[PDB]
Amino acid sequence: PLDVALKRKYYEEVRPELIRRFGYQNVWEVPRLEKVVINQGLGEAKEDARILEKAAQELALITGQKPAVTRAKKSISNFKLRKGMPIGLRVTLRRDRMWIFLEKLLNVALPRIRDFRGLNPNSFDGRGNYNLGLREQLIFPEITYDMVDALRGMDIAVVTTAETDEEARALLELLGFPFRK
Amino acid sequence: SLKKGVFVDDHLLEKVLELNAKGEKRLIKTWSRRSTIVPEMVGHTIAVYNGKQHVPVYITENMVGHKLGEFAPTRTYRGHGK
Amino acid sequence: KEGIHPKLVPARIICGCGNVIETYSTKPEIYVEVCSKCHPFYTGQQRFVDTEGRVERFQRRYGDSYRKGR
Amino acid sequence: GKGDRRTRRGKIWRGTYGKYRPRKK
Amino acid sequence: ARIAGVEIPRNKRVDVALTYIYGIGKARAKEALEKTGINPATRVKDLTEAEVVRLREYVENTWKLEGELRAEVAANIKRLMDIGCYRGLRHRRGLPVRGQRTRTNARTRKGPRKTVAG
RNA sequence: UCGCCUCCUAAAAGGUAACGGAGGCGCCCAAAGGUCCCCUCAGGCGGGACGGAAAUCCGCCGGAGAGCGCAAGGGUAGAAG
RNA sequence: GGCGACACACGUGCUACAAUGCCCACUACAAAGCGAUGCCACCCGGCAACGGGGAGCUAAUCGCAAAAAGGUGGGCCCAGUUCGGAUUGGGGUCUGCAACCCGACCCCAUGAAGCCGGAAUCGCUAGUAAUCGCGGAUCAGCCAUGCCGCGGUGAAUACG
Ligand SMILES: [Mg+2]
Ligand SMILES: [Mg+2]
Ligand SMILES: [Mg+2]
Ligand SMILES: [Mg+2]
Ligand SMILES: [Mg+2]
Ligand SMILES: [Mg+2]
Ligand SMILES: [Mg+2]
């Protein structure tokens, strides 16, 4: 079952705090952070695979899980690309790995961002989910800087069993999500 | 850039101070940027001369080393054919 | 699953101001300059400066010469 | 760098003295 | 070594490598390593980790630099936004701030020539 | 203009003419074929670095308005996709 | 207030794009001129501009000035780079009643364009061209990179 500090920190701190803040009557009504899915919009690989593979192993290093290529649904002559064409990587991670990633995310990567005054508090879904943009990917501890070729980023989706975007606003706030007030 | 002087017009201040006890009216002109922004009477308007007319400039903190006439451009320019 | 992904080893990692754990990832231990959960920059707040205001200082710098006073 | 105000050479050219060109000894 | 917001300069003298930061220049450079007590002519190649830590701790603190002071500088120009002075309008029109000659020259703020012809 | 396909004229079976009203065909696919196993669209509203009316990503809603190599009709996700 | 405006065009120039070069330290070698309603030695504060003192000098007596290129030493190692200094933020100083339009310096931080110039176009035949600094006039100050002078090191080539 491994261990993971953030995982524990959820159970023996963040968990009871929610039952006090919101007064859930059932052990399941409580918001449970599950499924974090990383996505990279890779137009950069409009016509390149050796620039896509380099983005693959890069992603595999920070999540410990191979990403899968996504392909264009249609065709847009307005900005090249046809039906096929590997345009975008994406890796889904839930359980254990989702926590090990979420720790290094909050407790290493996010502060390594230039300036960085805190995650956006309006960036909430309305159904209890959160998303956040990232520029440089070198902010991850497993990335060694002197081994990159291009500064490609990623979108991150954090899904949560909360109803409102308040119960999630709370759930993540407890886990260590800096919200720029 | 003065340091031990740091001056304002005596005549601008005479008119400004004797019209500062317990309140006033914003009707107050001048003829000299030469002065300085002057704290107190911040909620005031000083019609500064730009060479042609008296432009009502308004003080709302924020300004200090900028005397007056910087808030009173003397030229117009506006455009060059375009 | 088998025969593709990188493996995840135990915990150890060096921060530029103190300590960090978890790690896993791929590397046994890595170095991190700008620490996180520690304290600097929005972690307890360390107001480096304050960015001077003119209402305060410049009214007391230009006003330091209180010769124009009254 | 005859126009850089941070050299003994630029300070010569400008004429003036300072930190990057002291008034001798 | 990721000193402030940057890390780039390797094998090239710490008194010089320091310069490669918005906020350091040349004077604060040797001032920082004499106050931290480090040899200026060193390799910059990740030498004694301790010297690097002390350097980082002093430099990154003390005075504002990198993206933070760029924000402050830009904000000092934003000062003359509101209903600002004459100097603000010069930042508005894109013309030289210090009242210089604009009949010719001033290309560093105006930009390359546009040529009207008539 | 001349042969073939689709819709209307066509009068609720079929068929039905005019130098009547509108469009297509003279190909294509060794996968776009066989079978077994899986999966479900278009859109709309939110959320998300570069990234916009559309690229990929998350979240709800969405019974078929998508798709089905090309005209049109029929058919179709309890699949033909 | 304006002559200092600025989408632009031309003239004369200054500073450069670097290693026969740049930075720092040390250490030499001039001429021609100017100054007691000034030049201001030497101390003191100051990173510095400069401020406090204060001696000498109606000046081949005292002061402006140490000339700089040079030499020695050491550091960069060819990279928009310790080349380049524009532009911009901030902090100061001095003259002046006052320096926003529109002053010169000093200091911190930024460090742009430029890696040598299209068609065209200029100067110079011996201390000459090039390169290096120095003085003076105007002048409270200064937008002088100008003008008028002074000396330092010192080419190339002229068949015709
Ligand atoms: Mg029928
Ligand atoms: Mg019938
Ligand atoms: Mg017929
Ligand atoms: Mg004129
Ligand atoms: Mg360029
Ligand atoms: Mg070069
Ligand atoms: Mg001759």
How does DSSP classify residue B29? B
Q: Which residues touch strand F (CB under 7 A)?
A: A 35, 37, 39-44, 46, 70-74, 76, 78-81, 87-90, 92, 120, 122-127, 129-135, 152-157, 159
HSE on the CB side for A171, CA within 13 Å? 24
CA atoms within 13 A of residue E94's CA, in its CB half-sphere: 6
Pseudo-torsion of CA B30, B35, B40, B43, nearest 10°? 40
Integer distance in angstroms from the first to the last C-alpha of chain A? 35
Resolution of the PDB structure in angstroms: 3.3
Across E4-115, the runs of DSSP E, i.e. the strands, are none
Q: State how far the alpha carbon of A147 is from the alpha carbons of A54, A65, A143, A157, in Å.
A: 10, 20, 8, 27
CATH topology of domain A2-181: 50s Ribosomal Protein L5; Chain: A, (3.30.1440)
- Rg of chain A over Cα atoms, rounded to whole angstroms, equals 18
**Separation in Å, CA A114 to CA C9, D25, E6:** 29, 46, 10
CA nearest neighbour of E13 among E34, E39, E52, E32: E39
Query: How is chain A split into domains, by residue range?
Result: 2-181
Dig out the tokens for B31 from the structure: 């003829």
Q: Is the dihedral of CA E7, E12, E13, E15 positive or negative?
A: negative
Task: Determine the distance between E90 (CA) and G13 (C1') in angstroms.
Answer: 28
Q: What angle do CA C8, C11, C17 make, to 5 degrees?
A: 135
How close E2 gets to chain C, by Cα (Å)? 6
Closest C-alpha to B39, from C64, C59, E79: C59
Q: Which residue in A154, A16, A66 sits closest to C7, CA to CA?
A: A66
- Tell the residue number behind the tokens 């601008």, with chain if given: B12
- Euclidean distance between CA atoms B54 and B68, whole angstroms: 12
State how beta strands A68-71 and A86-93 pair. antiparallel
Residues of E in contact with A114 (CB under 8 A): 5, 66-67
What is d(CA E54, CA C27) in angstroms, rounded to the nearest whole number? 26
Q: What amino acid occupies position C27?
A: K
Query: How does strand A154-160 pair with strand A130-134?
Result: antiparallel
Identify residue E14 by its one-letter amino acid code. Answer: V
Tokens 């190649």, residue located? E45
Q: What whole-number distance in Å separates Cα of residue A68 and Cα of residue A80?
A: 22
The CA–CA distances, whole Å, from E59 to C45, C46, E18, E34 equal 18, 15, 9, 12
Give the gap in angstroms from C-alpha C49 to the nearest C-alpha of chain B: 20
Contact indicator for A119, A169 with CB cutoff of 8 Å: no
- Answer whether E3's CB lies under 8 Å from E61's CB: no
Of the candidates E50, E54, E52, E22, the residue with the CA atom closest to the CA atom of residue E35: E54
* CA-closest candidate to residue E71, choices E17, E108, E23: E23
User: What is the SS3 assignment for A75?
Assistant: coil
Report the top-level CATH class of E72-118.
few secondary structures
C38: Cβ contacts below 8 Å, ≥ 6 apart: C15, C17, C18
Are residues B45 and B25 in contact, defined by beta-carbon separation less than 8 angstroms? no
Cα–Cα distance, B16 to B40 (Å, whole number): 10
> Do B and E make contact, counting contact as 3+ CB pairs within 8 angstroms?
yes
Sheet of C19-20: strand order equals: C19-20, C13-15, C31-32
Angle at which helices E27-35 and E49-60 pack, to 10 degrees?
120
Of E13, E59, E5, E61, which is closest to residue E36 (Cα–Cα)?
A: E59
Could you give the angle at the alpha carbon of E28 between the alpha carbons of E26 and E29, nearest 5°?
A: 60
Task: Evaluate whether A131 touches A92 at the Cβ level (below 8 Å).
Answer: no
CATH level 2 (architecture), domain E1-71: Orthogonal Bundle (1.10)
Encoded tokens for B33: 């940027």
CA distance A107 to C18: 13
How far is it, in rounded angstroms, from Cα E66 to Cα A129?
A: 34
Give the angle subtended at the CA of A144 by the CAs of A140 and A145, to the nearest 5°.
Answer: 95
Rounded distance between C-alpha atoms, residue E7 and residue B50, angstroms: 52
End-to-end CA distance of chain C: 82
The answer for residues whose C-beta is within 8 angstroms of residue C50's C-beta and 6 or more apart is none
Q: Domain spans of chain B? A: 6-82
- The C-alpha angle with vertex E23 and arms to E37 and C59, in degrees rounded to 5, equals 110
From the centroid of its chain, how far is CA B56?
9
Any idea where the domains of chain E sit in the sequence?
A: 1-71, 72-118
Structure tokens at D6: 């941070």
Which are the contacts of D9, defined by CB distance < 8 A and separation ≥ 6?
D1, D2
Residue ranges of alpha helices (H) inside chain A are 5-9, 15-21, 53-63, 97-104, 167-175
CATH homologous superfamily of B6-82: Ribosomal protein S19/S15 (3.30.860.10)
What are the chain A neighbours of C48 within 8 Å (beta carbons)? none
**E strand or H helix at B13:** helix B10-17
Q: What's the DSSP call for residue B33?
A: T
How far apart (Å, rounded) are the C-alpha atoms in residues B64 and B62? 7
In A70-166, which ranges are continuous DSSP H helix?
97-104
C-alpha E15/C-alpha D18 separation (Å) is 22
Strand partners of residue A69:
A89
Proportion of chain A in helix, strand, coil states, percent, rounded to 5: 35, 20, 50
Question: What does the alpha-carbon distance between residue A88 and residue A166 come to, in Å, rounded to a whole number?
Answer: 31
DSSP character at residue C6 = P
Is the separation of the CB atoms in A128 and A164 below 8 Å? yes
Q: Does the annotation place C62 within a ligand binding site?
A: no
